[PDB]
Design an enzyme around this catalytic site. Structure first.
Site, short mmCIF file in Angstrom:
data_model
loop_
_atom_site.label_atom_id
_atom_site.label_comp_id
_atom_site.label_asym_id
_atom_site.label_seq_id
_atom_site.Cartn_x
_atom_site.Cartn_y
_atom_site.Cartn_z
N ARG A 272 0.95 -1.17 0.08
CA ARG A 272 -0.06 0.12 0.09
C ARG A 272 0.93 1.16 -0.27
O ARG A 272 0.63 2.07 -0.78
CB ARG A 272 -0.95 -0.03 1.19
CG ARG A 272 -2.06 -0.92 1.09
CD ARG A 272 -2.78 -1.15 2.15
NE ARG A 272 -2.14 -1.53 3.44
CZ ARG A 272 -2.48 -1.87 4.60
NH1 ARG A 272 -3.90 -1.57 4.87
NH2 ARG A 272 -1.80 -2.20 5.68
N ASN B 180 -6.10 -2.73 1.76
CA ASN B 180 -6.34 -4.15 1.97
C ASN B 180 -7.81 -4.90 1.82
O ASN B 180 -8.80 -4.22 2.58
CB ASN B 180 -5.61 -4.56 3.38
CG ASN B 180 -4.33 -4.67 3.28
OD1 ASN B 180 -3.76 -4.50 2.05
ND2 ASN B 180 -3.57 -4.92 4.11
#
Length: 90
Positions: free
Chosen positions: A19, A37
């Site tokens: 990320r 996520n």
């Protein structure tokens, strides 16, 4: 050529800096949206920006950061909604 790009990333993609890697590259490229996520273990990216920039981010997403093992990216392009002011991670 502003567009929105959706990308679903499968593989060894959580716990590996994914990320943050997407966020950094998005900020570098002037892209807004988010990397998130998902409970199944995969990651989703929604990105808005100029097409050329999105394509560069897509290339990065397919590679992942060094610890990731990307099995497949599914991506889809659609109308820019101008929904975002930053690039966030969740």
């Amino acid at each position: 050529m502003l567009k929105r790009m959706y990308a679903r990333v499968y593989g060894l993609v959580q716990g590996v800096g994914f990320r943050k890697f997407v966020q950094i590259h998005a900020i570098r490229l002037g892209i807004k949206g988010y990397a998130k996520n998902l409970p199944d273990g995969s990651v989703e990216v929604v990105a808005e920006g100029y097409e050329e920039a999105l394509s560069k981010l897509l290339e990065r997403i397919k590679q992942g950061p060094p610890a990731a093992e990307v099995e497949k990216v599914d991506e889809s392009f659609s109308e820019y909604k101008g929904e975002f002011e930053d690039f966030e991670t969740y």
